[PDB]
């Protein structure tokens, strides 16, 4: 009871802002627990700055660029946000304090990722995503680097093999899969917010304005685009399996696998589904197993791949591509 | 990689609803070996099941099926069944069969050979005694359990004992087969197929189809309970078999189907719904899945109690049902 | 196998809806030893429950129960309780008890002896203070956690450190017992039994039975939340105790009931239904058979409670504090 | 950081017996134990500097724990060999403040309590055997306790390890009593007396009389009585070591204990103090450590002269250690 | 327990190479093995006492196992060094009876069968190599068998350990043969002969001749032949050790075996064996507490012997043969 | 047992004094696989070493050695080396090789091939740069560590992760190789070959053979310390690699040699004997568990550190790498 009330506040913020990762983060072994919790909170504060449209580009860029350094400015905080999670910015001193209490080896990793992410975020403030190549670049900045950072923390803690943090491509794929999935799922919500994440070079081959997919008379063209993007995302699954297969720590495995499975289940539920453009989407041998051991995770993944495979319209324009990537996933 | 192997996995996912995923999740060489084993048995079953194939043509097909595995160009183009693709493109499947290590080939062909003979033996007859019921189930399921066990031991992912104890392996197949036969009474009766042992049901009604008559519901349920009680006798062997597995991917593959079958019997016990369509596959279970032996034991024991709780003193098999469950409870 | 052993397992399933399966799933010798431990405790509990047994007749039965384990012909035929069969056919159970290895016998007899003293002590009084609550729960459940832990170590399936940690083993039992006491308010009130601590409920109403009256539902829910908050304080010990276990069958046996109790408090928290009857119960992509998963499940249930805490509730700050402590460390 | 590198440089320059096993500890325990050692090294250096007046030393020992939080604190007036850890204390304190809070609380608490005890024995010598235990508690028992709390706080060892302070105390006492008994001569030729007065007085008038040849006979008897006292801690030592589950921690704890026991077996009834199966097993697993311990107990037992005033007691404590389990 | 405390005093009093690893055994094995050792010590002390007439000795050996259940039994007429365990046998037997029946059963059965064998060799010397194995079985092989049965009975080790009496017998024979080889001179000077006559008679007329300087070269050749014979038990020793799972049991078993192997390597082609006592580098970095380390140590000692084999030695081929088998057996 | 397998182990013991014992102590299938691996590599090395074979003849023998494993009758009767028995009786060895499971044969052949190629590359040239020194060491040692790591995983006694780490497995080999090279300076000098990197020694004396002359002893020990400082940089990889192992037999096999090498570098550091002939807590624990191996390593690092002359041209470097190892 004597210990850090500032750390208790950090865990309060974690549960306040994260519905999908708080439980598995708090379940991580030893040192990984606080390091990952803090990593999530600083990223949350950085993301809130990027998302706040009341902050002009001119004022925002320097904040994004120096955020990694604010981690070492004890009294720094930001009181001008109107975003829902602004509490992490207004009470950033409590968070940076605990960040500075982490072992240096973890601080180095977190700061490096924050620095790089800030640079990438600034880069995209005055431009939308065009090519699929730019889509990967953007996803790398806001998610790929997170997978890389998390992996570096795992190896640094010694709970996982040095290889985990070294193979940045596989770590990058973990983040990209989760990011592309959410982006595909949150089309309608993002569109109603003025933000666009779907690659221009893809939706433009369907409609004149991305926002057109929101209108009923374009539902067909929309779903087709939806399926092309989902097909794109599926290409990360082989890396995801490789990455998970290298994990040896149960708490880390649960942390990494559960979110990936939920993401795969989301793509399966969105595939060739019109509800993606009308609102939010929602949820048998798999119901017998959880995503806590590799063979079960593989089984769960394959079930979802077949669920998508048998719904692939010969009609749809991505049919051949979708079947091909699923076959690649199946034949190991 | 291989175009033919990718094709095999495509056929596996297209034909197997409940085994495709756990199969694809199997470690190393077991994966292709079991995938191919499933496909060849699927082709064999498709031939036996095709009523447009005369007995004159069918007996030779069933007896020699195993040898077609060795003939590069063999295929069957006269099937009128839904899964005929595996027969018409058998060369692709047999090619992969011949690519498997010789030790796996020995197992698969031996089983196909013995299964073919057995199926041929039953083309002209229905099941009479309970002994004949066991014989039939051995031919179409027990031998499969035996084959799988031999593949596991041959691959060395499991100890030699798994493949050597054919009676325990046979019990695994019999339990699944009997459970399916009991559950599918109505669907089969409407398909002109009879699998319930005649020496058992003849003690209740004159025609097996009479159980579908509302005025015979009481006798039908009594018979149902007698057959379920019969199947419960395989449980001790199932627990023994599963308790011997050391490979997680193999455990998942074997344990899940057994748990689903047990859940099914529990849902069917003393349930009139069995004779009015498919049944409702209905505590301390909720918090645990079937991926570790102790949990599997607990789930199995819980289902035995669901049955025990419903045993009416007036049922003709009540004492026998209590007796076998009591044996399952007490055995360590 | 043995005729008498078959009978014991028959009795286990007759008197246990939530433990029989995980007990039967225990490895080697723990199976029979835990089955027998359950049965003798069921018998002791039935004697304590029977209101048709005068207190002066009951005190010796409770004090001497442990010695009856060594009396081949001892049985009790004057009970009218629902589980009386274990008392009327106690010779069958004591026989199997005497068939257990001596190391298990010693632990079981010792716990029965100590529990008997505690139950006898509370026959003429109700739980007053929260400290008294902990004491009564120690007698009927804490000692059981301690006994079970010693059985685990005795069997060698668990490290000696498991049985040695009597403090946290005690917390494992207290948590399950308090949870049941909280949930079973109405059931016990209509049975003439009172388990809610008087120093706590008297700050709300004049009679514990008053919580049954619809016009006190508000006060009732406040006391409910205060008791739940008290119970939550054992979770840190539970997590520490579970984290030490290395045998899968033992882990399932201990972890599942704790998670089920946690799920129960979450469902009962700030729930008016507790006073009108029974209350029924990431989290789905993981079950409770590995420690990290059990932690995640517990944390999800804690947020379930945290998010529903009313500012007006008199225990609100205390409730947040303990959940915060659980989350943070 | 260079500051953490400097800390390990000091660790190696100051510790002959623990530097290696400390650096071999798993994860978090490594830096926490390294820092704990350095701060204790700095405190002991202050405690031993005779050029520091009492009125100046007492408050320093009492307030040492507080310097851990003062970024700029350092001591520039020491003439001791390891004065570098005092002159560059800011480097050590910086790394202490970088440790997780749970380790900081333990280290600070122990330093505060040891400083109190050290100041208490500046103006006096050890008289009774009870005072001897009190003195050893302050300079060593508390160290075992501190270390145990760190092991438990790191989660590498069971909660019980840090909670059982008596067993932890015994670990420290056994090491300290062994070094005190062994270093008799060196201490006398240094102006310090650590052997309990109520013990040596029963053999001579002045503790320094043991050095003179004409008293060697009485010196060895006193020597054997003290060793017999020390042996009483072995049961707790076995109990403590038996609870360890982390190999790096076991090595760290077991090796020094065995070396200490080997030392008492060498000093038993040996005049130089005042002037089998073993070779096939090392101290890296509990059963081996036990075997080794029993071996040394017999080397001592087989050498208990019936004429020695403590003969009976010595035999009794060895007997208790043998029949334990 | 004052009586149990006395038993451990005797153990340390009589055992120099086993008391430490015995006292380090986990749980119930500790007292069971301690008692087992004390009873055998007493039995061996009687068999050794030459002041006891044969007609008076045979009964003692044959009925020794029964004295375990005779609370007051004891022997006051022994003049041997370890007579304390006999004079105060009541203390020892008391603790024996405090042991779990399953342990008592094993111990008494071994004492019985051992007593039979000892009595049998009271009037004869060891002739054939077959009889040497027989003799060693009676005084050591059965001990390995009894100990293994105690391990399995305690459940600290699998049932196989106590079941494979062959491997267990081999464990005992290797230790006994090594000690018989090493203690030639001491035994000879003590008036006892343990070397097999069919082996030594091929070199000299009397076993005692090996104690004469003039026969030193023949003595060494016989020595090498007997060592070559003992080496044949190594395969079984490795197999037996590789099946153990309890660390305290492993140390108890491995240390004495490694020490015996070290002893044979030191005695091989060594004249010192007939003049006095023989005192026992990748090995440097290893201790005998983990199977792979134990294997490595054994292999090193084998090459130590192999490298010293004389071309002209009458057993050279056999020695290289068994060593080669040990090197190759996986 | 097969007489051909017994013969192999006979040769193993004949040509190995520090590896035979730990090889024979390996679990299951690793035992014969590693034994055979050692034997073939010994043959290959013997060929390179033989100065009676012309470069025109040697090259082919090196480049194709990996193929001789599948040629039942292949052998070599023209060697003058001490271990020619392995070449002259290679058929006995290839036979057992072909008895190994395919997964082991693959690994072994691959390494032999890549090794032969690399070896032929230095038949005429000497070691120039340190970069080149690692290159040569990678060929005769580095690749061996990789092959071994792959056999551990192939056997499955070790996690797939072990074989995957080619970089640290390579460092394991380079560390042992540089140590033997540094130590055997004089023997290799009085033997004909030069392995010390030219770029390094040519900065102290004009002829590498000059270190053998008393009027250079000082310059000698200085170059010595500089090389040891180079080899020390591999220790962090060694510790990391060893820390991953889970099989006791494999750990003992890998750990003992690394520790023996470290002890060797500590004995040679700032030691003159290197240019003439040959050359507590630690004594309480052996190299069979990782924490003990760390402790032993650290004690040796201290033995070298407290002997670092602040005059030596490497003093700064030596302290820097040791500091890194200590705080790692
Ligand atoms: C490591 O400890 C984990 C904590 C488990 O804690 C507890 C605490 C109490 C009980 C209980 C009980 C009862 O005696 C009370 N009544 C309900 C069950 C039985 C018989 C009548 C039980 C149930 C129980 C009792 C005996 C054997 C198995 C389970 N568990
Ligand atoms: C598990 O098998 C491992 C092989 C151990 O084999 C053996 C064989 C013989 C003995 C012995 C003996 C003696 O009876 C003979 N003499 C010397 C020691 C004692 C008393 C007199 C001993 C010593 C012994 C006897 C009883 C208990 C423990 C050890 N060990």
Tab-separated table of C-alpha atoms in Angstrom, chain E:
chain	number	residue	atom	x	y	z
E	1	UNK	CA	14.150	-38.988	18.756
E	2	UNK	CA	17.049	-40.092	20.966
E	3	UNK	CA	17.139	-43.568	19.428
E	4	UNK	CA	17.073	-42.236	15.863
E	5	UNK	CA	19.660	-39.656	16.886
E	6	UNK	CA	21.870	-42.548	18.007
E	7	UNK	CA	21.344	-44.376	14.714
E	8	UNK	CA	22.718	-41.407	12.805
E	9	UNK	CA	25.660	-41.272	15.197
E	10	UNK	CA	26.458	-44.884	14.304
E	11	UNK	CA	26.005	-44.240	10.589
E	12	UNK	CA	28.602	-41.445	10.617
E	13	UNK	CA	30.642	-43.629	12.960
E	14	UNK	CA	30.845	-46.591	10.592
E	15	UNK	CA	30.292	-45.084	7.148
E	16	UNK	CA	32.870	-42.717	5.675
E	17	UNK	CA	31.721	-42.856	2.059
E	18	UNK	CA	27.928	-43.154	2.389
E	19	UNK	CA	26.696	-41.333	5.506
E	20	UNK	CA	26.751	-37.968	3.717
E	21	UNK	CA	24.768	-38.987	0.627
E	22	UNK	CA	22.413	-41.080	2.761
E	23	UNK	CA	21.602	-38.159	5.060
E	24	UNK	CA	20.993	-36.104	1.908
E	25	UNK	CA	18.223	-38.412	0.674
E	26	UNK	CA	14.702	-36.944	0.353
E	27	UNK	CA	11.917	-37.794	2.805
E	28	UNK	CA	11.341	-41.394	3.848
E	29	UNK	CA	14.401	-42.760	2.030
E	30	UNK	CA	16.652	-41.015	4.554
E	31	UNK	CA	15.696	-43.131	7.575
E	32	UNK	CA	14.958	-46.236	5.494
E	33	UNK	CA	18.442	-46.246	3.926
E	34	UNK	CA	20.104	-45.243	7.192
E	35	UNK	CA	18.534	-48.202	8.968
E	36	UNK	CA	19.199	-50.512	6.033
E	37	UNK	CA	22.888	-49.612	6.237
E	38	UNK	CA	23.109	-50.142	10.000
E	39	UNK	CA	21.509	-53.585	9.900
E	40	UNK	CA	23.844	-54.683	7.107
E	41	UNK	CA	26.807	-53.312	9.082
E	42	UNK	CA	25.788	-55.471	12.039
E	43	UNK	CA	25.285	-58.507	9.794
E	44	UNK	CA	28.689	-57.973	8.179
E	45	UNK	CA	30.345	-57.448	11.565
E	46	UNK	CA	29.164	-60.910	12.636
E	47	UNK	CA	30.292	-62.580	9.419
E	48	UNK	CA	33.706	-60.947	9.889
E	49	UNK	CA	34.170	-61.974	13.516
E	50	UNK	CA	36.504	-64.969	13.371
E	51	UNK	CA	36.261	-65.337	17.154
E	52	UNK	CA	32.813	-66.799	16.523
E	53	UNK	CA	32.748	-70.547	15.847
E	54	UNK	CA	31.219	-71.673	12.556
E	55	UNK	CA	28.457	-73.686	14.244
E	56	UNK	CA	27.689	-70.609	16.340
E	57	UNK	CA	28.055	-68.232	13.379
E	58	UNK	CA	25.856	-70.007	10.823
E	59	UNK	CA	22.759	-69.618	13.057
E	60	UNK	CA	23.409	-65.906	13.570
E	61	UNK	CA	23.647	-65.208	9.833
E	62	UNK	CA	20.635	-67.357	8.962
E	63	UNK	CA	18.393	-65.887	11.668
E	64	UNK	CA	19.716	-62.311	11.650
E	65	UNK	CA	16.679	-61.054	9.751
E	66	UNK	CA	14.497	-62.350	12.589
E	67	UNK	CA	16.415	-60.406	15.236
E	68	UNK	CA	14.892	-57.294	13.670
E	69	UNK	CA	11.618	-58.197	15.365
E	70	UNK	CA	13.183	-59.230	18.670
E	71	UNK	CA	13.189	-55.949	20.673
E	72	UNK	CA	15.779	-57.220	23.149
E	73	UNK	CA	18.128	-59.109	20.838
E	74	UNK	CA	21.761	-58.008	20.806
E	75	UNK	CA	25.265	-59.465	20.591
E	76	UNK	CA	27.695	-58.934	23.460
E	77	UNK	CA	30.457	-61.364	22.437
E	78	UNK	CA	31.799	-59.483	19.401
E	79	UNK	CA	35.397	-58.256	19.459
E	80	UNK	CA	35.232	-56.387	16.145
E	81	UNK	CA	35.551	-52.619	15.710
E	82	UNK	CA	31.876	-51.936	14.938
E	83	UNK	CA	30.557	-54.035	17.821
E	84	UNK	CA	28.522	-51.040	19.004
E	85	UNK	CA	25.772	-51.674	16.449
E	86	UNK	CA	25.537	-55.200	17.848
E	87	UNK	CA	25.789	-54.383	21.546
E	88	UNK	CA	23.150	-51.692	21.031
E	89	UNK	CA	21.201	-53.453	18.297
E	90	UNK	CA	17.944	-52.888	20.254
E	91	UNK	CA	18.209	-49.172	19.456
E	92	UNK	CA	18.670	-49.928	15.752
E	93	UNK	CA	15.945	-52.579	15.576
E	94	UNK	CA	13.566	-50.185	17.339
E	95	UNK	CA	13.948	-47.617	14.561
E	96	UNK	CA	13.689	-50.400	11.982
E	97	UNK	CA	10.250	-51.252	13.345
E	98	UNK	CA	9.293	-47.554	13.137
E	99	UNK	CA	9.750	-47.738	9.359
E	100	UNK	CA	6.781	-48.207	7.039
E	101	UNK	CA	6.039	-51.915	6.570
E	102	UNK	CA	6.886	-51.774	2.863
E	103	UNK	CA	10.410	-50.706	3.811
E	104	UNK	CA	10.690	-53.280	6.588
E	105	UNK	CA	9.638	-55.961	4.100
E	106	UNK	CA	12.440	-55.077	1.689
E	107	UNK	CA	15.137	-54.785	4.360
E	108	UNK	CA	14.249	-58.027	6.178
E	109	UNK	CA	14.044	-59.979	2.927
E	110	UNK	CA	17.512	-58.799	1.912
E	111	UNK	CA	18.988	-59.534	5.340
E	112	UNK	CA	17.555	-63.052	5.092
E	113	UNK	CA	18.854	-63.814	1.604
E	114	UNK	CA	22.181	-62.136	2.331
E	115	UNK	CA	22.637	-64.159	5.507
E	116	UNK	CA	22.073	-67.332	3.510
E	117	UNK	CA	24.818	-66.454	1.048
E	118	UNK	CA	27.323	-65.356	3.680
E	119	UNK	CA	26.788	-68.584	5.617
E	120	UNK	CA	27.342	-70.489	2.375
E	121	UNK	CA	30.783	-68.976	1.776
E	122	UNK	CA	31.861	-69.491	5.382
E	123	UNK	CA	33.718	-72.706	4.521
E	124	UNK	CA	34.822	-71.953	0.957
E	125	UNK	CA	36.856	-69.469	-1.071
E	126	UNK	CA	35.863	-67.968	-4.410
E	127	UNK	CA	36.861	-70.258	-7.265
E	128	UNK	CA	35.350	-69.470	-10.665
E	129	UNK	CA	34.538	-66.022	-12.011
E	130	UNK	CA	30.950	-67.254	-11.917
E	131	UNK	CA	31.329	-67.845	-8.173
E	132	UNK	CA	32.885	-64.388	-7.776
E	133	UNK	CA	29.690	-62.870	-9.192
E	134	UNK	CA	27.700	-65.127	-6.892
E	135	UNK	CA	29.693	-64.051	-3.850
E	136	UNK	CA	29.410	-60.380	-4.824
E	137	UNK	CA	25.680	-60.862	-5.365
E	138	UNK	CA	25.321	-62.000	-1.760
E	139	UNK	CA	27.280	-59.141	-0.204
E	140	UNK	CA	26.664	-56.284	-2.654
E	141	UNK	CA	24.356	-57.173	-5.525
E	142	UNK	CA	21.423	-57.785	-3.176
E	143	UNK	CA	22.168	-54.445	-1.516
E	144	UNK	CA	21.759	-52.654	-4.825
E	145	UNK	CA	18.569	-54.652	-5.331
E	146	UNK	CA	17.290	-53.788	-1.858
E	147	UNK	CA	18.089	-50.093	-2.230
E	148	UNK	CA	16.403	-49.950	-5.646
E	149	UNK	CA	13.326	-51.577	-4.139
E	150	UNK	CA	13.377	-48.966	-1.400
E	151	UNK	CA	13.561	-46.215	-4.014
E	152	UNK	CA	10.557	-47.510	-5.955
E	153	UNK	CA	8.634	-48.272	-2.758
E	154	UNK	CA	9.143	-44.664	-1.641
E	155	UNK	CA	7.814	-43.633	-5.050
E	156	UNK	CA	10.611	-41.086	-5.528
E	157	UNK	CA	11.692	-43.318	-8.423
E	158	UNK	CA	9.665	-45.239	-11.018
E	159	UNK	CA	8.705	-48.915	-10.443
E	160	UNK	CA	11.240	-50.020	-13.080
E	161	UNK	CA	14.209	-49.183	-10.838
E	162	UNK	CA	13.294	-51.774	-8.215
E	163	UNK	CA	12.049	-54.102	-10.952
E	164	UNK	CA	15.243	-54.429	-13.010
E	165	UNK	CA	17.111	-56.570	-10.477
E	166	UNK	CA	19.811	-57.229	-13.093
E	167	UNK	CA	20.860	-53.595	-13.452
E	168	UNK	CA	20.587	-53.109	-9.693
E	169	UNK	CA	22.708	-56.212	-9.108
E	170	UNK	CA	25.317	-54.810	-11.504
E	171	UNK	CA	25.460	-51.587	-9.488
E	172	UNK	CA	26.424	-53.561	-6.408
E	173	UNK	CA	28.916	-55.860	-8.147
E	174	UNK	CA	30.847	-52.976	-9.679
E	175	UNK	CA	31.371	-51.375	-6.268
E	176	UNK	CA	32.215	-54.679	-4.556
E	177	UNK	CA	34.583	-55.874	-7.281
E	178	UNK	CA	36.354	-52.521	-7.306
E	179	UNK	CA	36.878	-52.636	-3.540
E	180	UNK	CA	38.011	-56.273	-3.598
E	181	UNK	CA	40.561	-55.401	-6.286
E	182	UNK	CA	41.751	-52.281	-4.440
E	183	UNK	CA	41.939	-53.936	-1.011
E	184	UNK	CA	43.978	-56.973	-2.026
E	185	UNK	CA	46.890	-56.273	0.320
E	186	UNK	CA	44.824	-55.226	3.333
E	187	UNK	CA	42.654	-58.335	2.976
E	188	UNK	CA	45.657	-60.604	2.436
E	189	UNK	CA	47.368	-59.228	5.532
E	190	UNK	CA	44.061	-59.767	7.293
E	191	UNK	CA	43.932	-63.428	6.349
E	192	UNK	CA	41.061	-63.134	3.871
E	193	UNK	CA	40.985	-64.029	0.175
E	194	UNK	CA	38.386	-62.641	-2.229
E	195	UNK	CA	40.149	-62.855	-5.598
E	196	UNK	CA	38.799	-65.790	-7.681
E	197	UNK	CA	41.132	-68.794	-7.587
E	198	UNK	CA	40.486	-69.773	-11.201
E	199	UNK	CA	41.882	-66.397	-12.196
E	200	UNK	CA	44.857	-65.988	-9.865
E	201	UNK	CA	45.935	-69.651	-9.964
E	202	UNK	CA	46.869	-69.142	-13.614
E	203	UNK	CA	49.612	-66.788	-12.430
E	204	UNK	CA	50.770	-68.096	-9.056
E	205	UNK	CA	50.409	-71.090	-6.736
E	206	UNK	CA	48.921	-69.072	-3.863
E	207	UNK	CA	46.958	-65.804	-3.854
E	208	UNK	CA	49.281	-64.606	-1.112
E	209	UNK	CA	52.169	-64.710	-3.580
E	210	UNK	CA	51.041	-61.395	-5.046
E	211	UNK	CA	52.215	-59.825	-1.789
E	212	UNK	CA	55.823	-60.892	-2.555
E	213	UNK	CA	58.024	-58.397	-4.488
E	214	UNK	CA	59.281	-61.083	-6.840
E	215	UNK	CA	55.762	-61.648	-8.210
E	216	UNK	CA	54.939	-57.991	-8.828
E	217	UNK	CA	54.738	-58.369	-12.620
E	218	UNK	CA	52.406	-61.380	-12.452
E	219	UNK	CA	50.334	-59.617	-9.780
E	220	UNK	CA	49.757	-56.619	-12.036
E	221	UNK	CA	48.705	-58.855	-14.938
E	222	UNK	CA	46.133	-60.569	-12.730
E	223	UNK	CA	45.093	-57.154	-11.429
E	224	UNK	CA	44.481	-55.965	-14.986
E	225	UNK	CA	42.437	-59.095	-15.791
E	226	UNK	CA	40.174	-58.571	-12.772
E	227	UNK	CA	39.718	-54.886	-13.584
E	228	UNK	CA	38.786	-55.828	-17.153
E	229	UNK	CA	36.212	-58.170	-15.636
E	230	UNK	CA	34.709	-55.404	-13.467
E	231	UNK	CA	34.511	-52.968	-16.401
E	232	UNK	CA	31.833	-55.183	-17.934
E	233	UNK	CA	29.332	-53.838	-15.393
E	234	UNK	CA	29.745	-50.252	-16.598
E	235	UNK	CA	27.111	-50.555	-19.339
E	236	UNK	CA	24.522	-51.558	-16.700
E	237	UNK	CA	25.695	-48.807	-14.354
E	238	UNK	CA	25.111	-46.167	-17.017
E	239	UNK	CA	21.694	-47.620	-17.863
E	240	UNK	CA	20.671	-47.757	-14.213
E	241	UNK	CA	21.865	-44.205	-13.488
E	242	UNK	CA	20.163	-42.830	-16.612
E	243	UNK	CA	16.752	-43.958	-15.315
E	244	UNK	CA	16.879	-42.060	-12.027
E	245	UNK	CA	14.753	-38.917	-11.685
E	246	UNK	CA	15.269	-37.813	-8.068
E	247	UNK	CA	18.350	-35.637	-7.537
E	248	UNK	CA	19.063	-36.907	-4.023
E	249	UNK	CA	18.793	-40.504	-5.258
E	250	UNK	CA	20.960	-39.748	-8.291
E	251	UNK	CA	23.775	-38.275	-6.179
E	252	UNK	CA	23.558	-41.197	-3.758
E	253	UNK	CA	23.954	-43.619	-6.661
E	254	UNK	CA	26.277	-41.760	-9.053
E	255	UNK	CA	28.953	-40.491	-6.642
E	256	UNK	CA	30.004	-43.931	-5.319
E	257	UNK	CA	29.998	-45.366	-8.849
E	258	UNK	CA	32.108	-42.530	-10.253
E	259	UNK	CA	34.439	-42.929	-7.285
E	260	UNK	CA	34.766	-46.655	-7.977
E	261	UNK	CA	35.474	-46.024	-11.662
E	262	UNK	CA	38.085	-43.420	-10.672
E	263	UNK	CA	39.599	-46.071	-8.398
E	264	UNK	CA	39.839	-48.738	-11.115
E	265	UNK	CA	41.493	-46.227	-13.448
E	266	UNK	CA	44.063	-45.442	-10.760
E	267	UNK	CA	44.681	-49.123	-10.006
E	268	UNK	CA	44.992	-50.250	-13.608
E	269	UNK	CA	48.481	-51.528	-14.423
E	270	UNK	CA	49.564	-50.018	-11.098
E	271	UNK	CA	52.103	-51.886	-8.959
E	272	UNK	CA	51.166	-49.674	-6.024
E	273	UNK	CA	48.120	-51.887	-5.492
E	274	UNK	CA	50.493	-54.542	-4.155
E	275	UNK	CA	52.667	-52.200	-2.109
E	276	UNK	CA	50.188	-49.895	-0.403
E	277	UNK	CA	47.275	-47.538	-0.984
E	278	UNK	CA	46.399	-45.983	-4.342
E	279	UNK	CA	45.055	-42.444	-3.972
E	280	UNK	CA	42.612	-41.289	-6.645
E	281	UNK	CA	41.069	-32.322	-18.051
E	282	UNK	CA	37.645	-31.602	-19.532
E	283	UNK	CA	36.572	-33.453	-16.386
E	284	UNK	CA	37.881	-30.610	-14.219
E	285	UNK	CA	34.868	-28.498	-15.204
E	286	UNK	CA	32.444	-31.201	-14.046
E	287	UNK	CA	30.908	-32.810	-10.954
E	288	UNK	CA	28.957	-36.088	-10.787
E	289	UNK	CA	25.458	-34.647	-10.278
E	290	UNK	CA	23.901	-34.751	-13.763
E	291	UNK	CA	23.809	-37.767	-16.097
E	292	UNK	CA	25.605	-36.234	-19.101
E	293	UNK	CA	28.392	-35.046	-16.808
E	294	UNK	CA	28.605	-38.513	-15.248
E	295	UNK	CA	28.889	-40.086	-18.698
E	296	UNK	CA	31.664	-37.698	-19.732
E	297	UNK	CA	33.605	-38.451	-16.538
E	298	UNK	CA	33.271	-42.197	-17.015
E	299	UNK	CA	34.440	-41.949	-20.628
E	300	UNK	CA	37.479	-39.925	-19.629
E	301	UNK	CA	38.534	-42.527	-17.070
E	302	UNK	CA	38.058	-45.259	-19.684
E	303	UNK	CA	40.494	-43.515	-22.040
E	304	UNK	CA	42.856	-43.131	-19.092
E	305	UNK	CA	42.857	-46.925	-18.834
E	306	UNK	CA	42.824	-47.506	-22.589
E	307	UNK	CA	45.888	-45.315	-23.061
E	308	UNK	CA	47.833	-47.341	-20.463
E	309	UNK	CA	47.067	-50.826	-21.822
E	310	UNK	CA	50.325	-52.742	-22.460
E	311	UNK	CA	50.521	-54.518	-25.817
E	312	UNK	CA	51.989	-57.597	-24.164
E	313	UNK	CA	49.414	-57.717	-21.346
E	314	UNK	CA	47.582	-61.100	-21.482
E	315	UNK	CA	44.243	-59.239	-21.223
E	316	UNK	CA	44.997	-56.367	-23.636
E	317	UNK	CA	42.452	-57.512	-26.243
E	318	UNK	CA	39.670	-57.980	-23.695
E	319	UNK	CA	40.358	-54.590	-22.114
E	320	UNK	CA	40.226	-52.763	-25.442
E	321	UNK	CA	37.133	-54.789	-26.324
E	322	UNK	CA	34.986	-53.819	-23.334
E	323	UNK	CA	36.200	-50.209	-23.454
E	324	UNK	CA	35.276	-50.086	-27.146
E	325	UNK	CA	31.814	-51.424	-26.282
E	326	UNK	CA	31.410	-48.733	-23.624
E	327	UNK	CA	32.502	-46.015	-26.074
E	328	UNK	CA	30.049	-47.180	-28.743
E	329	UNK	CA	26.960	-48.110	-26.709
E	330	UNK	CA	24.436	-45.290	-27.136
